[PDB]
């Protein structure tokens, strides 16, 4: 229950690579950062966390299954020793610690399981490592508190949670971060914390979510509507945010030597415009839209289907490298720009669509293109530039 | 009391000149719309326009449908129609009803 | 998605009234939409036969003339009275060797004007249909649901608060 | 209603040796067709028949047979997994082969009626 | 407000021998016509002057007179039951006989 | 969000000899136009621009310019009060003189372009 002491904290300003396009692109978490994933049942919190545990570029992963399903912890103990890094031949299990206290396990020990994990993570962080701790789910932790609060006969807080819920949560998230460890080396380490929140009815105005959002800088807001449509990860791109976005943008531009932050901004601008336009299409139909407006919907659809949607259970869709993400986004954004220019010269939406069936299909398959051949994503740019330019006749 | 404007190819539309109709002879997208937007500025009641000429400027044309005046009416050339007038009636009816009801 | 309102007893009563109003307004907007539609169908049929007839005839006139100098260098304007169809503002339009080809054009004018008038009326009629559709739809798919969802939410909240109060009152009493 | 419905663990109980090799692919496909079909119905109600592509109509008809012939079996009718999968293939035949994008050619060749 | 107001024992106190024979029937009719009038008023706002039937415009005017003349008697005006009944009839007389469906023709002919 | 925001000490701290003699008039005027313009802008998002009046269309464009230009200055932008009051006028000039009921004729003559 006592945080391991350090020399000082540092700004977490290096992005973690999850391999999840929507996360790394629009809502990045840095090393030593804290992200919450609140969402309704079946939305995909457990999967997002598993993905990260599987792919992120940390040294070590601590996975706390707090008050969740037994099968899920079972799944990790079986799947992880079989997941082999080809560059080094070590399995994920060689870099993982699992803490399990399932929902039908003693309730008090939900609180125990959180502290055990964070303390272990501090310890490796102290040695100089980059550690990620996933808490699935912090809501079960809060329920344990309420139950003990009731036995203690304490005066209730919000929704029967004890008055100290907000600070307990804040204390735990502050044990995470980028640090210079104790010792003469002044070595640096980090804990990145990814917590599921499981709000009743999916209502995020609930105290656990609200208190969490107070101290974490990244909000991955899962939508049941998206999940039902099979759009996974069901991250709601309008409501979600990363407060690390600006800094991660600067960092990416420099490491990529490319205007990444601009591409991201343009992508978010496009998605924001689609939400304005779909409000009308629901009312009156797509027919009312101008050609400019028609295209925005089609580009936005591309970001959503070809880029935002990622099958965690597909062998290639499951992880996307930084370079690949830059390439996939370029292509999608390029097609947008080229058409926008084609429309302004005098061509019409419908002739641009029909003239580009094949290259659009190519774009929608980039996510399946092998990491050893990113050049096949890259060549799509010239195909876009040429095929549209012919149409302009 | 509002004026009448006619936009079309010299061959087909020149006789309207006999009635005092402001007949105009635009042939590119720039000319037609430039010539329409002034006609709307001078409170014209109706503007007749050839289908071939109309096909160049759907954006400027649909901008006035909701206005009481000017009425923009599509006419054939000496060569005939592209099917736009009748298809615009076709579209508007399916839009309103879930047709075709005709 | 529920509206941003405070769960008070008065708010609940407001939204419930606002909802009964919304419901009734939606039916009346649907009723109009349907009326305008059947009035639209009559006029759009008129437009169609009229446009088919005046396309075939203007076409012949034009072809005759072409098959036949600035003899066309030497006035008619029109009058627009305004009338109402259901609630829609609608236009009323009144006039205000080669000789055979010139005449055919004189005989088109009346039919061209009627078309101008009927086509506009239909256009205006069609737009007002879309305008009503959008209101019906904004009510059926946004306003009524939000009201309904906010109302149910506030009922629930007012209920939790009442329960919270009795919990605290029981504890208060037992400080004794 | 198969849309809000989900089995999370389903692939541990399907496939060759368990149901049949065509199982997962047909499932992904029927689901997608039904979702697209239902969305087309939703469009016809709001804006009328005319707002639909000929293809939408096919999908709309797909959704309707799916509901009436596949889902609706009666509370006294037992369907073996083989009878179920085969019926899945029949509703798939309604659609252009070119439409069945979630299913590879090898399966389409063996099963598509 | 008459619409949400209610007396549970009115019938035991009305009609022939106690007030007048026409009491109940007129109450039922005024109650409906006022309901219809308020609906007609709404229609006026939503669909506009034009969508109103001439029979509808009357109900509108009825609900207006009913609030302003019948219900609005003033805090110092004592109306006998007979004046009240007579004023109701006067108000019902705005409508066509064809509309007063909840009154026996027997009573329509006696009181107008 | 200026509408729910407040300052209770603005009167004795502004005006002639403190900011400028048009501080309070323009301030009040801007609020009036913004509150109304904001209601008009939102209707237009729901019922289409066509469902708006001729002048409420203007009020809506005003609320766009007010938010995007006036309130949105950036976190590294230091505007003198004189720059701020002058910008306020440029927005108010979007509107017809008759709308500006919160400002006295004496002040309009002098400052309004
Ligand atoms: N990223 C993904 N890619 C593909 N499928 C997914 C993804 N995320 C979720 N799913 C599917 O949707 C289901 C829900 O994921 P799950 O991890 O159970 O979400 P959850 O929010 O943790 N549910 P709960 O723990 O009950 O609140 C999984 O069984 C998958 O079928
Ligand atoms: Mg879970």
UniProtKB/Swiss-Prot annotation, chain A:
Gene Ontology CC terms:
proton-transporting ATP synthase complex
- What start-end ranges are recorded for coiled-coil regions in this protein? none
- The entry's ATP-binding residues are 39-46
Provide the E.C. number(s) assigned to this enzyme. Answer: 7.2.2.1
- Protein induction: By increasing intracellular Na(+) concentration.
GO MF term set: ATP binding; proton-transporting ATP synthase activity, rotational mechanism; proton-transporting ATPase activity, rotational mechanism; sodium-transporting ATPase activity, rotational mechanism
Q: Which GO terms describe its biological process?
A: proton motive force-driven plasma membrane ATP synthesis
Which catalysed reactions does the entry list for this protein? 4 Na(+)(in) + ATP + H2O = 4 Na(+)(out) + ADP + phosphate + H(+)
Alphabetically list the UniProt keywords.
Answer: ATP-binding, Ion transport, Nucleotide-binding, Sodium, Sodium transport, Translocase, Transport
Q: Which family does it belong to?
A: Belongs to the ATPase alpha/beta chains family.
What task does this protein carry out?
Answer: Involved in ATP-driven sodium extrusion.
Q: What is this protein called?
A: V-type sodium ATPase catalytic subunit A
Task: Say which species the protein is native to.
Answer: Enterococcus hirae (strain ATCC 9790 / DSM 20160 / JCM 8729 / LMG 6399 / NBRC 3181 / NCIMB 6459 / NCDO 1258 / NCTC 12367 / WDCM 00089 / R)
From Swiss-Prot, chain B:
One Gene Ontology biological process: sodium ion transport
MF terms (GO), sorted A to Z: ATP binding; proton-transporting ATP synthase activity, rotational mechanism; proton-transporting ATPase activity, rotational mechanism
Keyword check for Magnesium, yes or no: no
The record's listing under InterPro entries reads:
ATPase_V1-cplx_f_g_su (IPR008218), ATPase_V1-cplx_fsu_bac/arc (IPR022944), ATPase_V1_fsu_sf (IPR036906)
Pfam short name (any one): ATP-synt_F
**Does the record carry Methyltransferase as a key word?**
no
Which cysteines pair up through disulfides? They are: none
| Keywords assigned | Ion transport, Sodium, Sodium transport, Transport
Any idea what job this protein has? Answer: Involved in ATP-driven sodium extrusion.
Q: Which family does it belong to?
A: Belongs to the V-ATPase F subunit family.
Check the record and name the HAMAP family matching this protein: ATP_synth_F_arch
Q: Which NCBIfam families match?
A: PRK01395.1
Name the record gives this protein: V-type sodium ATPase subunit G
Protein's organism: Enterococcus hirae (strain ATCC 9790 / DSM 20160 / JCM 8729 / LMG 6399 / NBRC 3181 / NCIMB 6459 / NCDO 1258 / NCTC 12367 / WDCM 00089 / R)
Q: What is the lineage of its organism?
A: Bacteria, Bacillati, Bacillota, Bacilli, Lactobacillales
Curated annotation (Swiss-Prot), chain E:
Describe what upregulates or represses it: By increasing intracellular Na(+) concentration.
Ion transport recorded as keyword: yes
Per the record, the GO terms for biological process are: proton motive force-driven plasma membrane ATP synthesis; sodium ion transport
Molecular function (GO) terms for this protein are:
ATP binding; proton-transporting ATP synthase activity, rotational mechanism
User: What keywords sit in the KW lines?
Assistant: Ion transport, Sodium, Sodium transport, Transport
Q: What does this protein do?
A: Involved in ATP-driven sodium extrusion.
Q: Which family is this sequence assigned to?
A: Belongs to the ATPase alpha/beta chains family.
Name of the protein described by the UniProt record = V-type sodium ATPase subunit B
Organism of derivation: Enterococcus hirae (strain ATCC 9790 / DSM 20160 / JCM 8729 / LMG 6399 / NBRC 3181 / NCIMB 6459 / NCDO 1258 / NCTC 12367 / WDCM 00089 / R)
